[PDB]
Amino acid sequence: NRQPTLHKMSMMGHRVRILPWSTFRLNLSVTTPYNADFDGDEMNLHLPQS
DNA sequence: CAAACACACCAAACACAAGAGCTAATTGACTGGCCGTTATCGATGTATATATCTGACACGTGCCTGGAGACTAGGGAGTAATCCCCTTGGC
Ligand SMILES: [Mg+2]
């Protein structure tokens, strides 16, 4: 999720993949819904426990 | 005249002002009265240090008594002769 959640397409599930360096990554096509810009954005990540 | 409602106006409040995310730094109560502990000032000593006076011992000076010195007066102690009393000695 990205902090300003304007519409439904702003909190979608994803499958986890662990990569060496310390930065969230996501395919560029999925940038448009979130309205992210990879210019120092921040995007939250919640995990269900059930 | 008094009471009903309606309208325009004035006066008084309520709540909102996107989602959030990170970092920094300024504020660290205070006079006063009073009780409770404790430090200090004060008296009332008894122990020890020092000063004055009295007592015993020491060195020194002294007043007094008796002893000692030089010199004197004049007579006590004492040679040298004599008598003859009396003792020792004898048959
Ligand atoms: Mg951007």
Side-chain angles (χ1 to χ4, degrees), chain A residues 3-48:
Chain A
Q3 196 60 24
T5 55
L6 300 173
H7 60 285
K8 184 177 70 176
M9 311 298 191
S10 302
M11 310 182 68
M12 292 78 82
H14 296 262
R15 293 185 294 90
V16 178
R17 187 172 176 175
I18 293 182
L19 300 177
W21 297 90
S22 68
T23 59
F24 288 149
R25 304 179 191 74
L26 64 172
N27 182 316
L28 289 68
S29 305
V30 189
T31 310
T32 307
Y34 299 135
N35 202 14
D37 201 6
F38 304 156
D39 64 331
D41 304 354
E42 306 290 20
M43 292 184 66
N44 310 342
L45 193 171
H46 313 262
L47 174 69

